[PDB]
Amino acid sequence: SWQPPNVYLETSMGIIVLELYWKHAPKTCKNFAELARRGYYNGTKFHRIIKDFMIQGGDPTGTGRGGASIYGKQFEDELHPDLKFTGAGILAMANAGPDTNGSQFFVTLAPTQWLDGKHTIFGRVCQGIGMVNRVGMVETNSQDRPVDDVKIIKAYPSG
Amino acid sequence: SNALAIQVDSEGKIKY
């Protein structure tokens, strides 16, 4: 269990440094540390991309179903009463419903307060907020799927 | 918006 907060994620758009919040949810941070250590994402494409609401990825299939954890196939949601979905660039765990978490993830684009009591607020981007704003402008269909490959080159859980 | 949607690929130059 380490907590240097920087994450040296290497994507097709560019290298983004992501600040993990080991302060508020160490469990999901340790699970993604273990998985990105084992390289679950070295060559995974973002799947659901919505303008001004969220950018979702982490699906190896890209079909909105793939995901596997160390605590079973699914693990637990965690919260904090001062981290709320308020702002852009807010990394979080992609989810179906509570008491369940897949390996997928997403970031948001706006103060989205009605989702604070649901999902694990998992990180935030510090270098590369223009990067995630540029990635947020990929054209997608009504099924929210991209045009060409936008794929994670390499993952590093730096710390 | 009023303007179009600006698209550049992930790696290379500006797509037209």
Partner: protein, 130 residues
């Protein structure tokens, strides 16, 4: 094909940016329209059951994944306890007696099935509107 693939739910906050109707599935601009091969007769029977008595069984495939109720106005179904229109009912009540002349002998007196039944201030407003 496997059950786990199609039954796997979707990760996400469901995208509440849309309205209810545009987020809802379709193929036609108004609902997913798809063919069917129901029996003609039971279609017509439960159709006429609703058309007369205001209740029928509900048609579905995946609403609740279990659906076995009645619809329309509910309580009159169990007032008749689920009888149909093609059934000789439990009682013969509120019938209405026609008068019959089925001889074909009298003239202007023979009414067979053509029998008219035994039962056989506003105009100021109508003249002021017109």
């Amino acid at each position: 094909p496997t059950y786990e693939t199609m039954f796997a739910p979707e990760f996400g906050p469901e995208n509440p940016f849309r309205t209810q109707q545009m987020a809802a599935p379709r193929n036609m601009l108004s609902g997913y329209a798809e063919p069917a091969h129901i029996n003609d007769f039971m279609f017509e029977q439960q159709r006429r059951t609703f058309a007369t008595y205001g209740y029928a069984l509900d048609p579905s495939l995946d609403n609740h994944q279990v659906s076995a109720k009645y619809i329309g106005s509910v309580e009159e179904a169990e007032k008749n306890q689920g009888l149909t229109v093609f059934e000789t009912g439990q009682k013969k009540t509120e019938k209405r007696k026609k008068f019959k002349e089925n001889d074909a002998s009298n003239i202007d007196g023979f009414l067979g099935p053509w029998a008219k039944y035994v039962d056989e201030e506003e105009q100021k407003e109508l003249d002021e509107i017109t």
